[PDB]
Amino acid sequence: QVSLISTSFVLKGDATHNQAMVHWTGENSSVILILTKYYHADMGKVLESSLWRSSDFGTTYTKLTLQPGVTTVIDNFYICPAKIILVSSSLGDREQSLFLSTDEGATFQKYPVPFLVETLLFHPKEEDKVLAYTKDSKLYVSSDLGKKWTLLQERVTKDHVFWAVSGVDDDPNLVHVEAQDLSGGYRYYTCLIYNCHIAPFSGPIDRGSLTVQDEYIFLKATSTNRTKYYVSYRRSDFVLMKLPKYALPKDLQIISTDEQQVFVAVQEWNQVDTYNLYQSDLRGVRYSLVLENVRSSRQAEENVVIDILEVRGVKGVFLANQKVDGKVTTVITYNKGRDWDYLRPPSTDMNGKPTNCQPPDCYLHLHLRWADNPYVSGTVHTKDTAPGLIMGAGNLGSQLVEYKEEMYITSDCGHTWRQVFEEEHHVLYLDHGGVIAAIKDTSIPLKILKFSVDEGHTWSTHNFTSTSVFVDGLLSEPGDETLVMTVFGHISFRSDWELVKVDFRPSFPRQCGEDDYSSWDLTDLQGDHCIMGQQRSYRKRKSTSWCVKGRSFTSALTSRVCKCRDSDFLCDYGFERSSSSESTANKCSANFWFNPLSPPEDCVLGQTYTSSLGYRKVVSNVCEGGVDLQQSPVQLQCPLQAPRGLQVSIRGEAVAVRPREDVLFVVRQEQGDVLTTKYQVDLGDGFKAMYVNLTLTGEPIRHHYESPGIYRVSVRAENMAGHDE
Amino acid sequence: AVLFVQVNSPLQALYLEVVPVIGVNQEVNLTAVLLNPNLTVFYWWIGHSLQPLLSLDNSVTTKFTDAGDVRVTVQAACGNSVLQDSRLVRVLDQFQVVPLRFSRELDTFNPNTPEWREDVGLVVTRLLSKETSIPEELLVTVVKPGLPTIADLYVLLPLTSDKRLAAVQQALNSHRISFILRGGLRILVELRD
Amino acid sequence: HMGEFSVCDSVSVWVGDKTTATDIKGKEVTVLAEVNINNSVFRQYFFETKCRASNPVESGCRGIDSKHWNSYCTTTHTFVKALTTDEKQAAWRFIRIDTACVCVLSRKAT
Amino acid sequence: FHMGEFSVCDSVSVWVGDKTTATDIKGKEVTVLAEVNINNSVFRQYFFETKCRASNPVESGCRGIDSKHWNSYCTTTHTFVKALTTDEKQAAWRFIRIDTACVCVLSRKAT
Numbered sequence A: 001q002v003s004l005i006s007t008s009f010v011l012k013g014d015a016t017h018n019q020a021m022v023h024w025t026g027e028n029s030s031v032i033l034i035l036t037k038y039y040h041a042d043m044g045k046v047l048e049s050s051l052w053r054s055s056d057f058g059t060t061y062t063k064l065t066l067q068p069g070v071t072t073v074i075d076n077f078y079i080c081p082a083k084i085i086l087v088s089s090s091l092g093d094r095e096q097s098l099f100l101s102t103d104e105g106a107t108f109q110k111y112p113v114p115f116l117v118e119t120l121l122f123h124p125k126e127e128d129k130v131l132a133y134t135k136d137s138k139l140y141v142s143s144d145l146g147k148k149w150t151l152l153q154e155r156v157t158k159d160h161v162f163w164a165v166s167g168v169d170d171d172p173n174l175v176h177v178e179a180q181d182l183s184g185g186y187r188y189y190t191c192l193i194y195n196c197h198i199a200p201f202s203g204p205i206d207r208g209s210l211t212v213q214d215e216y217i218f219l220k221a222t223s224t225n226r227t228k229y230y231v232s233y234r235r236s237d238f239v240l241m242k243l244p245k246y247a248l249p250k251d252l253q254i255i256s257t258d259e260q261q262v263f264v265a266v267q268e269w270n271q272v273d274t275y276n277l278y279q280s281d282l283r284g285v286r287y288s289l290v291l292e293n294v295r296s297s298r299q300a301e302e303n304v305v306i307d308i309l310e311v312r313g314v315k316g317v318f319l320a321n322q323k324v325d326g327k328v329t330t331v332i333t334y335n336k337g338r339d340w341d342y343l344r345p346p347s348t349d350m351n352g353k354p355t356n357c358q359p360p361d362c363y364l365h366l367h368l369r370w371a372d373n374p375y376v377s378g379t380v381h382t383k384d385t386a387p388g389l390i391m392g393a394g395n396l397g398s399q400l401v402e403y404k405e406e407m408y409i410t411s412d413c414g415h416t417w418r419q420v421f422e423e424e425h426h427v428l429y430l431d432h433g434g435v436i437a438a439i440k441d442t443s444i445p446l447k448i449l450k451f452s453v454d455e456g457h458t459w460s461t462h463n464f465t466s467t468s469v470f471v472d473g474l475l476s477e478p479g480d481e482t483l484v485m486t487v488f489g490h491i492s493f494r495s496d497w498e499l500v501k502v503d504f505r506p507s508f509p510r511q512c513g514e515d516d517y518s519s520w521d522l523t524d525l526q527g528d529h530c531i532m533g534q535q536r537s538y539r540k541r542k543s544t545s546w547c548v549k550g551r552s553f554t555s556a557l558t559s560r561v562c563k564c565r566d567s568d569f570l571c572d573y574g575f576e577r578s579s580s581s582e583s584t585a586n587k588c589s590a591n592f593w594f595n596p597l598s599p600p601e602d603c604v605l606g607q608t609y610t611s612s613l614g615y616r617k618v619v620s621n622v623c624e625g626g627v628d629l630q631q632s633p634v635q636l637q638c639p640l641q642a643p644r645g646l647q648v649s650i651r652g653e654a655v656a657v658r659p660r661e662d663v664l665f666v667v668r669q670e671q672g673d674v675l676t677t678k679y680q681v682d683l684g685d686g687f688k689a690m691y692v693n694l695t696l697t698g699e700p701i702r703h704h705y706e707s708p709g710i711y712r713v714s715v716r717a718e719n720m721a722g723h724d725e
Numbered sequence B: 001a002v003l004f005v006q007v008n009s010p011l012q013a014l015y016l017e018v019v020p021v022i023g024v025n026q027e028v029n030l031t032a033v034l035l036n037p038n039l040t041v042f043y044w045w046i047g048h049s050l051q052p053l054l055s056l057d058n059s060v061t062t063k064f065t066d067a068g069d070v071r072v073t074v075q076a077a078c079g080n081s082v083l084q085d086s087r088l089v090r091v092l093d094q095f096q097v098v099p100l101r102f103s104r105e106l107d108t109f110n111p112n113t114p115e116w117r118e119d120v121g122l123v124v125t126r127l128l129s130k131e132t133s134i135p136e137e138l139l140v141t142v143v144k145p146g147l148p149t150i151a152d153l154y155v156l157l158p159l160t161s162d163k164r165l166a167a168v169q170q171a172l173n174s175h176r177i178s179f180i181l182r183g184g185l186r187i188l189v190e191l192r193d
Numbered sequence C: 001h002m003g004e005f006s007v008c009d010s011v012s013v014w015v016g017d018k019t020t021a022t023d024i025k026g027k028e029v030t031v032l033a034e035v036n037i038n039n040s041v042f043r044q045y046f047f048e049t050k051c052r053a054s055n056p057v058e059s060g061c062r063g064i065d066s067k068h069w070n071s072y073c074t075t076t077h078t079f080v081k082a083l084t085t086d087e088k089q090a091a092w093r094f095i096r097i098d099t100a101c102v103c104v105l106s107r108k109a110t
Numbered sequence D: 001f002h003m004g005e006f007s008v009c010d011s012v013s014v015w016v017g018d019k020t021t022a023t024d025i026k027g028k029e030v031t032v033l034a035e036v037n038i039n040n041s042v043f044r045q046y047f048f049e050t051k052c053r054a055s056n057p058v059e060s061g062c063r064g065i066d067s068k069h070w071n072s073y074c075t076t077t078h079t080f081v082k083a084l085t086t087d088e089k090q091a092a093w094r095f096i097r098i099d100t101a102c103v104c105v106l107s108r109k110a111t
């Protein structure tokens, strides 16, 4: 029927327990490294370890030795990204060292460290460049693979240091840092590989610097009664992000700054349960509503999780779990968030008795990122590696529960779902969705293994081991175009570890030809082919063919275009939709707090702003424009600004003032700067003085009071538009 | 030996809550919203006189014998930090007061942020002016801080004021004055008996 | 075939759909489906593990010196504290839960 | 006492009120609370632990083994109990590993 090989191996060391790390080295190398480490609780944090290396698909592991008492390798041993180099870290009471390899861990050379260590981080492309986070919160760097070291920063924050993108920004030697300045200041620095200071905007943050490797940079400005959040696109000047003025945020998290725009989640009302999903434009400023409610938890102390999954196989496909009242429902969108809908039930299994759910009153639901129930040991997952393939565990009805989890799969990107397994199952993909392997996720050991080569329509069972094993993890050879699988866990009767190599290549040793595929046109839940303005059709491997989809995969070969429609436009910032689903079309009306007549921020006299009508084309929608609700109003104007938000303050924290002292005064506005603005000033002691463009200076003015006592300072901002005090 | 100590180091923000308009000889229930227990230091600058009033409580109650514009300032220094907020209010004499009912649904989306309340009152005033053709700056809407959303409208003069009152009454009752709060959510405003 | 055999064949399963059980005193009690503690709702999950069969082979347990011994497999027994009710009062009672399958012997008379 | 002479392996039971440390299902060592508060009622975490006395009750591992064809040894098995424990951060009703019985393991010999 099929043809494969399976080989088990036990780490020969009898003294094996506690934890372990398994990692491949580069693509198509057949070399695996493992660190078997022994932890200690009760504030000990001590480690004892051994090192293992396999140079043959993980079928034979050699215990790598060193001459003295075996080195206490600590936690992260890590490889060089992209270019094979290995680094191992070692802890002592106060002492430290390092080990470096250039031949896949065959010859580890020893080097010393002139500082402590907590973690490391390589450069995405530079092979010999790597920085080091030092336990006492420091940041060192090295361009010679860590043989020697120099110092960059001294008060960095935990896991808020980044490298500049190598593909973007055209400069690859930058180091972005979130570091504590002075006493209780947090700033954003940018240094280079040699030395340093603050090129972009910098203010106060409470540990919230976030830079996704795409074009965006973000900032969390904590303030006095209302907080702010800033964005920087293509390393431009920082701009306050446009959130609803009165739909107030408590906390927020960047869901996806992937592809063209920004997806953020913002918890408005403190239900401690739900978030709202907002979407921006290409610049990442104009945020509009997309999804109403989503689950939200907090496993780690300061880390939260939000139930949403973006299918990378098709740009613009999202799945999300909403929590309304007490019901957790699953919804999907192909319109990149414009319209969402439920998942279609299969109504078939081994016994497809149609007493199961029909469309009208109960659909299909999936546990995306949350496993409520205890017996499952591994983290829950719904995977989306291949285009059109989405496999995951869930319920089948009106909401999700903890009791019953069934493994469903879809091969046409949500349109057709099918039920496969009872209970949850670890899933591993091979050959860009060519082979799907499943292992029951539970606390009981097992010896079975499910696998399917036809996208979950026919599975086969295999005894991959002899003694029953606790399943800890599934890994694949890097690239995922291969067909080599690695299973690892500790067996039942004894505690020693066990790994299993699985090789499906004996059944797939041939390359797929262009005639080894069948057609599959992309539709949605409505049978419409114009998705994102583009009719797409993909290829699916023939059932009567045993071939490899290849190092490079051919997808979306049949591409046709459509003209734009009302379904290709959503509301702009501050506009909302009327009525309900399958009723009134996309009518975006302006809500009350803001009106599109208002001028934009910083319209200097001379410029001409363009008012908006409340609609915008779906970002990444490639429909034929020209006609079909382009809605270019051609409304050009700009008015003179009026003085508002006038506030006078004293520089710093001079809570008490002494007579004959350099007292510094600063005045600020909020509604632009008109180039003819009068600022009258009385300093309470008869000092009359009128100035112009005080906010243009930004620097204080000195004054010295003669008599001890109380005074009232009055400032008047005046134009030909209004007056403020 | 005795030593009294107090422990309230950080102060975040303050805000002075006061209605924008009230008549002469009326008691004003000024509130000083601050970050705090009964340990609170409050300096109150009610008017022109320098000498500030001392208070441990958030609220004070005062009057105004004169009309016009009054500067009301409040300063808070519980620990070693100084916060201060000011507000200018109008004291009138020629006006008519109208109570205003809002729809109940608005309550479920009503934060007491004074700027939200300001924008709501401004929207109500705009709609009143658009449905009565009367001057817009002579209509002041204050929607209160209470949990149930209740508004009060001040209608100024600078007779014909009876017909203006009747015009607003017809604008609210005979035609229901509508308000688009949230997408798919419409609020209505009418009279509060 | 090979590897490491268990002397008796066991069957493990998690049970969240628990309705009835037997308490420590021997009275049939009713296990509540869900528990409320600190406004958190838990499902009563119990890990049960019984025997697959009392005769894995012809001579009772597997791998016994049958020439001089008689053998048979039997289920184990432990107690778990769970929120139950006895048709009258709801309380946190201890209930009987299976955990393993063990072989027991008896000397054979040649 | 229809069991027989003895079990194939030497078992020993005990009730543990002195529960301080344990290992959860995820493999992390946690600290066990001494007492539990539910509503206003205070309980104590008692655990019923049954383990082995020895891995070789006789010379050929387990008691009553056809050692001419098998190798044997006794080992302690377990189950998971939902108990109120805590880590360095938060306390929760975690499932921890508790010994509950003693079993025998066999392996085929080479004739």
Ligand SMILES: *[C@@H]1O[C@H](CO)[C@@H](O[C@@H]2O[C@H](CO)[C@@H](O[C@@H]3O[C@H](CO)[C@@H](O)[C@H](O)[C@@H]3O)[C@H](O)[C@H]2NC(C)=O)[C@H](O)[C@H]1NC(C)=O
Pocket: A225, A226, B013, B014, B015, B033, B034, B035, B111, B112, B113, B145, B146, B147
């Ligand atoms: C700072 O700004 C915040 C909003 O960001 C203001 O917080 C809100 O203040 C109102 C008025 O005090 C709170 O409503 C109150 O609720 C209590 C019940 O807890 C009720 O008894 C009162 O009658 C009043 O309605 C509201 O909960 C609070 N929070 C939010 C999210 O709106 C605050 O007033 C501002 N203050 C300062 C000093 O900056």
Ligand SMILES: *[C@@H]1O[C@H](CO)[C@@H](O)[C@H](O)[C@H]1NC(C)=O
Pocket: A448, A462, A463, C001, C002
């Ligand atoms: C392999 O597993 C199958 C299904 O569980 C079972 O029928 C068969 O006996 C097993 N074989 C071995 C050698 O374990």
Ligand SMILES: *[C@@H]1O[C@H](CO)[C@@H](O)[C@H](O)[C@H]1NC(C)=O
Pocket: B027, B028, B029, B061
């Ligand atoms: C001020 O408000 C408080 C709170 O309702 C009330 O007890 C008091 O009577 C009010 N005083 C005046 C003069 O309105």
Ligand SMILES: *[C@@H]1O[C@H](CO)[C@@H](O)[C@H](O)[C@H]1NC(C)=O
Pocket: B038
């Ligand atoms: C604070 O002290 C004042 C004394 O004037 C008293 O009236 C008030 O009830 C006290 N409030 C609290 C919360 O103790």
